[PDB]
Design a protein around this ligand. Structure first.
Ligand SMILES: CC(C)(COP(=O)(O)OP(=O)(O)OC[C@H]1O[C@@H](n2cnc3c(N)ncnc32)[C@H](O)[C@@H]1OP(=O)(O)O)[C@@H](O)C(=O)NCCC(=O)NCCS
Ligand SMILES: CC(C)(COP(=O)(O)OP(=O)(O)OC[C@H]1O[C@@H](n2cnc3c(N)ncnc32)[C@H](O)[C@@H]1OP(=O)(O)O)[C@@H](O)C(=O)NCCC(=O)NCCS
Lengths: 385, 286, 385, 286
C-alpha cells in the first residue's frame, strides 16, 4: 500500500531525516494559519494524492501570501486531481501540505526497491534529480549507482559513503548523505516497505541535504505486523470496488471493456482475459474468485463486475475448486435472478459435474450460455457482445 | 520425474489445521507416503492415523522424512521454514500465501547456503502423476507421461495438465513455483532438472507478468536445454502498475510485460503459444 | 565486565522478563523500609558482590521481620564477603538486595555464552537448576540442551520451543519459556554481552517462570557503544591496581609469588612467568607493558608490582618495541632510583642497542643484573630470591 | 612460503593514521609492494609517495591490489573489513585490537561465505622473510629459511623467530593469527598451508590459554600433517578465570588450560617444548 507525502515526511522525522517544516491541512482556515507557524514565506502548497505528476497538473505551487494559500486550499479541497498517473477521475484531494519553500542548489535522486533479479533490497542514487528515474535508466543508465543491502549484515556506512562519492559529494555532505542512507535502509527494513523514492533529495543553497519529496510504498503482506502503518491507509485514494471485493475474498481490478470475466485463479483470470482479447473481445476487468464459488460469493462478484455500466456480457470461467460444478451452476443461476443480470453470461465449467452443471444452466431458461470448452466460451461472449 | 516419487516420505507442518487436514487426507488417498506431521503443542497425538510431533526434529528422527509440506499462516511461516531446514529436511513445499517479501528474502539466502530446496511459497505444490502428490491440485486430471510443467500459477497449470492428458501425453512431474516475488526456486532451477530427466521429453513453461525470470530462463534454455519447450505467458492485457491477484504479478517500472517475455522466449527458440488453449496442439507438433 | 545481580534484574525488567519484586539498598534504614514496599514477608535479603557462592558464605538469607532485615544490612554493609570464587579478601558489599520470597516448584538452568569452538552465541538449558553448570556438564552432560543463534536470522521462536520441550515443559509454560528465550537472546545481542546465567530459572508453585538469580557479563570491547552499561561498572569489586595499571596502558593481574615480571606482550609475559616457574621461581603477577617502555611508563609499572609486599626480586624482560634498548635501560635505572626499588632487578633486553643497554645497567652501580639471555635471566632472579 | 610473497601488491586501509603511516613506511623499506591506501575523505592525495583513495573499490580498480592491511580503530573495523571484502580483496590482515567479539562473529561468517582470507584481528601480521612484510614485526630478526611459525601472540613469535635464525634455520613464512576469541583464521587453516608448502620443512606452533583450537589442531595434525611440528603453549601459570592481557586469553569454565593443550599436542605426536628457550634446540633435533 501507498503512503501520502505528508505521511512519509512524518516518518522521516521520526527517524531524524531532514524534510522541510510543513503542516498537513484539511480546511483552508488551517492552510492559511500554517503560513505564520512556518514563517516568512514564500511557501509551497501541495495537493496530497497518492499519484505522481501533481506538479504538472497544477497540484503544487509556490505562493506569496496567506491569501494565495486560502485560495489554493479552496480550489482543491474536495476536488479530484487528475495526474498522468491517475485515471480519468484522478484522486480526491482531502488534504493540502503547506511547507517552507526551499533554497535549491542541486537536485539528486535517492531510491530503494526489492530487486527480484538479485533478491536484494537495492538503493539507487543519481545526479539527475527532478526526473522520472525510468527515463534516466533507459536514457543514461550510467548516471545511476546502486548498492544492495546484505541480509546477514544490514546496511553499512561504506555503502553510504560509496554512493556519496559516486555522486561527487564531498565533506560534511558525504557524511550527511551517509546518515540519510543509513536511516532509510533502517526504515525500509523495520517497516517492511517495498519502495522508497526521495526525488528530489536536494543540496540547499546553504549546503545541507534535505528530502524535498517522499514517496513510500509499504508491503501489504506485512501489515499484520505494522499496526501504525495499518492505520495510515487512505482508502479514498483506491477504487472502492477493490476494497469491496477484498472483503469477500475476491481480487478485482477494473478496466475499459464491454466483457466481464469472473475466474478462479489470478493466472487463469489473466489467461482468460487474454483469450477473450485474442478473439476480438475487450475485457472490462480482472476478477479472481478467492474463496470457493459459493452462491453468496458468486453473487457479490456479479455486483462488483456489473457496477461498471459499459459491461455487455459476462464470461464466467471456472476450472476446479472446492465446490462441485453443479453447485456453482446453481449459484450462478441464482445470482442472475436475484442480482438481476440483464446481460448474457457465457459459462465454462470444468471439473466435477461439469457436464451435469452445464445442463442445469442450459435448462434454466435464463440467458446463460454453457460453452463447450474455453475457446468456444471465448468466441461466444465476443459474439454475444 | 523430478523432485518427488513413490518413495519420498513426507511430513506436514500445520497438520492439524484446516488446510493441513484437508489436503493431507487427499495425499494419503493418492498414495502419497505421508509418514506424520507437526503442530507445536499437539505432539503425542495422532491425526489421520499418522503420529503428530512437537518439533520438526522430533518428527524427522522418528520417521526418516526428507520432505515437508507447510500449511502454517503467513505470520509464522519464516519460523517454520527455518525450523524445517534446521532439522534436516531437504525438500520444503510451502503452500502459504501472504508471506512478507522481506521474510522470503532472508529465508532464500538461508535455503541456498544450506542446500535445501523450497518449492513456493504461494504455490499449488508438486505432483509426480502416478507416485506422489503434495499440494492442492486435483489429481484426477493427471496421467503418468512425458511432459514436465513448471508454472508461476496454480489453476493455469490445470489447463495444461488437462490438455497434455487429453492429447495422450500425460506428465512426468508438474511443478508450481508460486506467484510471489521471491520464490525459493525459479524456472532455471527447475528446467535444469527436467533437462536431466529421462522421463521428460518436452517441457511446458507457463509464466505471467512481472519480474524477469522468464527472460532469465529464455537465456538459459538457449544455452542449456535440449528438449523442446512450449511456453505460454498470462498477462498481455494487464494494466501497468497493478498487482494482478498474485503478489508478484505487477509490471513494475514499465518492465516485465507479457509481450517482452514471449519475445524473449521466441529467440531462445521456444514454441510460444499465444492462446492457452493450444498447449496441447503445439506439443503435438513437437 | 561484570554486572551486579540487582543490575541484571533491572535490565530484565526493561525487557519485560520476570524477576521478583525487590529493592537495592545502601543503608539499613532503606533495607528495613523495603519490607513494607514489597509486602508481607517473608523476604530474601542478598549481598550484592560480583562473585558466586554467596549463599554458602552467608550472604543470602530468608528472613521473617523487618528487624532481621536491619540486622543483616548492619552485619554486612561495608564488610567484605569472601566466597569460594572471590579471593582471600572477598569483595566489598556496599549494597543489599531485598526481594519478595519465591514459591519454588521447580529449578531450571538457562544460560548463554559465545562458543569459540562453533563461533556462535549458544544458549544451554537444563533441568538441574541450583547447581554449578560446570559440575553438570562433566557429570551429566546429557542433561544439557543447546541451541545456537544464527547470525543471518537472529534468535527464532522454534529454538525456544525446541528447548521448552526438551525440558519437558508443556502448555503456557512452553510459550512463557519461549518469550524468555527470545528476550535474553535479544538483550545478549543488543547490549554486546559475553555471558548470561539465570540459575535458577524457577517454575513457581503457581505455574509461572521467574528468573530468580541473574548473572551478566558484558564484553569490555563494546563499551564504546554501550554508554548505559559503561555507567554500571563497580570498580570496587575489582583489584584497584588493575584499573590503575590500565590508565597507563599496562595489563596487571596479581598473584601469590615473590618474583615480579614486567614484560612487553601478553604471550611473552605468560611465557616468561612460566620460564621463571619452571626454574624454581614463583611469579607474583602478570604485567604486560602496553605503551612503549618509556621512563614514566616503566616507573608506574614499578609502583604497581612493588605495591605487593611479598615481592622479592623483579624480572624485567623486553624483546623489541618502539624504544631503543638503551633508552629503556635508562628508564629502568631511573625508575629504580626514583621509585626506590630495594629489590634486585634482573633485566633481559633484546633488540636494538641491547648490548649497549645492558652495559649502562651493569655500570650503574645499582642492584640491577643484566642477563645474558632469557634462560640465564630466569635463573638469576630465581637465584636472587 | 605461504600467503604473501615478493609479488603480492598490498593497499592499507587507515593509511594516513599514526600506525598506518608508521608501519607502512617500514613495509616500504622492507621492499613490500605497497601500491597505495585508503582513508575516506582523503582520496586524491598521495601519502608516502603512494596514491590515497576514497573507497577500497577505487583503490582496487586503480592498483590491482589483492591484499589489504587494516589499521582502523575498533569502532569502525567491521565496516572496513566488510568494505574490503565487498571490493574484491582476497587477503585481509587486520592489526586492530579491541574489536567487539560479536562484530567478529558476523564478519567471520561473511569471510567464509565469500572465500576471503583474514589474518587477525589483534595480530602482528604476516612476513615471508625475504619478500614481504605486512605487520608490525621487526624484520631484521628474520632470515629466509625452512621453518614456518603460527602463533596466537606477537612478541612471543619474536622469540622463536630469533632462535630459528640463530640455529641457522630461518623461516618460510611467519604467521600471527591474533589473540582474540574469534580470529578470521585458526591453526588448522594455516597448518594446511604449511603442510602443502615445499619451502616448509618443519612447523613451529605457539599457542596459549583459552579456547580449544590448539586441541582442535592437535587432532588435525595427527591425521593430516606430515612435516614435523614443535609446539609451545604459554599459560601454565595463569590464574583460572582472568583475561591475561589478550582478549581471548582466559580459562573459561575450568577449560582450555595450558596443560590440557600440551597434553593434546603430545598425543598428536608433536614435540612439545616446556621452555620457550628450547624451540631452537628441539627443531635441531627434528
Ligand atoms: C497457510 C494456510 C493454508 C493456513 O490456513 P488454515 O489451515 O485455514 O489455518 P489454521 O489456523 O486452520 O491452521 C494452521 C495450523 O498451523 C498451526 N501452526 C502455527 N504455527 C505453526 C508452526 N510454527 N509449526 C507448525 N504448525 C504451526 C496452527 O496451530 C494451526 O493448527 P491448529 O489449529 O491445530 O492449532 C492459509 O494461511 C493460506 O495460506 N491460505 C492460502 C493458501 C493458498 O492460496 N495457496 C496458494 C496455492 S496456489
Ligand atoms: C588500529 C589502531 C592501530 C589505530 O590507531 P592510530 O593509527 O593510532 O589511529 P589514528 O586515529 O591515528 O588513525 C586511524 C585512521 O583510520 C582512519 N579511518 C577511520 N575509519 C576508517 C575507514 N573505515 N576506512 C579507512 N580509514 C578509516 C582515520 O580517519 C585515521 O586516519 P586519519 O587520521 O588520516 O583521519 C589502534 O586502534 C590499535 O588497534 N592499536 C593496537 C594495535 C595492536 O596492538 N595490534 C596487535 C598487534 S600484536
Amino acid at each position: 500500500m501507498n503512503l501520502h507525502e505528508y505521511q512519509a515526511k512524518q516518518l522521516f522525522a521520526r527517524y531524524g531525516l531532514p524534510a522541510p517544516v510543513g503542516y498537513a491541512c484539511t480546511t483552508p482556515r488551517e492552510a492559511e494559519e500554517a503560513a505564520s507557524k512556518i514563517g516568512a514565506g514564500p511557501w509551497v502548497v501541495k495537493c496530497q494524492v497518492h499519484a505522481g505528476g501533481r506538479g504538472k497538473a497544477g497540484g503544487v505551487k509556490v505562493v506569496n501570501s496567506k491569501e494565495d494559500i486560502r485560495a489554493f486550499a479552496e480550489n482543491w479541497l474536495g476536488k479530484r486531481l487528475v495526474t498522468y498517473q491517475t485515471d480519468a477521475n484522478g484522486q480526491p484531494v482531502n488534504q493540502i501540505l503547506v511547507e517552507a519553500a526551499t533554497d535549491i542548489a542541486k537536485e539528486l535522486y535517492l531510491g530503494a526497491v526489492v530487486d527480484r533479479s538479485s533478491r536484494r533490497v537495492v538503493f539507487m542514487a543519481s545526479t539527475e534529480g527532478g526526473v522520472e528515474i525510468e527515463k534516466v535508466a533507459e536514457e543514461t543508465p550510467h548516471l545511476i549507482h546502486k548498492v544492495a543491502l546484505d541480509p546477514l549484515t544490514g546496511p553499512m556506512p561504506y555503502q553510504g559513503r560509496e554512493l556519496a562519492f559516486k555522486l561527487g559529494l564531498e565533506g560534511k555532505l558525504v557524511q550527511q548523505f551517509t546518515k540519510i542512507f543509513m536511516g532509510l535502509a533502517t526504515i525500509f527494513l523495520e517497516r517492511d516497505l517495498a519502495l522508497i523514492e526521495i526525488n528530489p533529495l536536494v543540496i540547499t543553497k546553504q549546503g545541507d541535504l534535505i528530502c524535498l519529496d517522499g514517496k513510500l510504498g509499504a508491503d501489504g503482506n506485512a501489515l499484520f505486523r505494522q499496526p501504525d502503518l495499518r492505520e495510515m491507509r487512505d482508502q479514498s485514494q483506491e477504487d472502492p470496488r477493490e476494497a469491496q471485493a477484498a472483503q469477500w475474498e475476491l481480487n478485482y481490478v477494473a478496466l475499459d471493456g464491454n466483457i466481464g470475466c469472473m475466474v478462479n485463479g489470478a493466472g487463469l483470470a489473466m489467461g482468460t482475459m487474454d483469450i477473450v482479447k485474442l478473439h476480438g473481445g475487450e475485457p472490462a476487468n480482472f476478477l479472481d474468485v478467492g474463496g470457493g464459488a459459493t452462491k453468496e460469493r458468486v453473487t457479490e462478484a456479479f455486483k462488483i463486475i456489473l457496477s461498471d455500466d459499459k459491461v455487455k456480457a459476462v464470461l464466467v470461467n471456472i476450472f476446479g475448486g472446492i465446490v462441485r460444478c453443479d453447485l456453482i451452476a446453481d449459484g450462478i443461476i441464482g445470482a442472475v435472478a436475484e442480482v438481476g443480470v440483464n446481460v448474457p453470461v457465457v459459462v465454462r465449467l470444468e471439473g466435477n459435474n461439469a457436464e451435469l452443471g452445464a445442463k442445469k444452466l442450459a435448462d434454466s431458461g435464463l440467458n446463460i450460455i454453457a460453452a463447450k470448452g474455453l475457446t468456444d466460451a471465448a468466441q461466444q461472449v465476443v459474439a454475444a457482445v | 520425474s523430478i523432485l518427488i516419487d513413490k518413495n519420498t516420505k513426507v511430513i506436514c507442518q500445520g497438520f492439524t489445521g484446516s488446510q493441513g487436514t484437508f489436503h493431507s487426507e487427499q495425499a494419503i488417498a493418492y498414495g502419497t507416503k505421508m509418514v506424520g506431521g507437526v503442530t507445536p503443542g499437539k505432539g503425542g497425538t495422532t491425526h489421520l492415523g499418522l503420529p503428530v510431533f512437537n518439533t520438526v526434529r522430533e518428527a524427522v528422527a522418528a520417521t526418516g522424512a526428507t520432505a515437508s509440506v507447510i500449511y502454517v499462516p503467513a505470520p509464522f511461516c519464516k519460523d517454520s521454514i527455518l525450523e524445517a531446514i534446521d532439522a534436516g529436511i531437504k525438500l520444503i513445499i510451502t503452500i502459504t500465501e501472504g508471506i512478507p517479501t522481506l521474510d522470503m528474502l532472508t529465508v532464500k539466502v538461508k535455503l541456498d547456503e544450506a542446500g535445501v530446496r523450497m518449492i513456493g511459497p504461494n504455490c499449488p505444490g508438486v505432483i509426480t502423476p502416478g507416485e506422489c502428490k503434495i499440494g492442492i491440485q486435483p489429481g484426477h486430471i493427471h496421467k503418468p507421461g512425458k511432459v514436465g510443467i513448471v508454472s508461476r500459477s496454480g489453476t493455469l497449470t490445470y489447463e495444461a495438465v488437462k490438455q497434455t492428458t487429453d492429447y495422450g501425453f500425460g506428465q512426468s512431474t508438474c511443478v508450481g513455483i508460486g506467484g510471489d516475488p521471491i520464490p525459493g526456486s525459479n524456472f532455471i532451477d527447475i528446467l535444469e532438472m527436467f533437462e536431466k530427466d529421462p522421463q521428460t521429453e518436452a517441457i511446458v513453461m507457463i509464466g505471467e507478468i512481472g519480474g524477469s525470470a522468464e527472460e532469465e530462463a529464455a537465456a538459459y534454455i538457449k544455452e542449456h536445454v535440449t528438449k523442446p519447450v512450449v511456453g505460454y505467458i498470462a498477462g498481455v492485457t494487464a494494466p501497468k502498475g497493478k498487482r494482478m491477484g498474485h503478489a508478484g504479478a505487477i509490471i513494475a517500472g514499465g518492465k516485465g510485460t507479457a509481450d517482452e517475455k514471449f519475445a524473449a522466449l521466441e529467440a531462445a527458440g521456444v514454441k510460444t503459444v499465444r492462446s492457452l488453449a493450444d498447449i496441447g496442439e503445439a506439443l503435438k507438433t513437437v
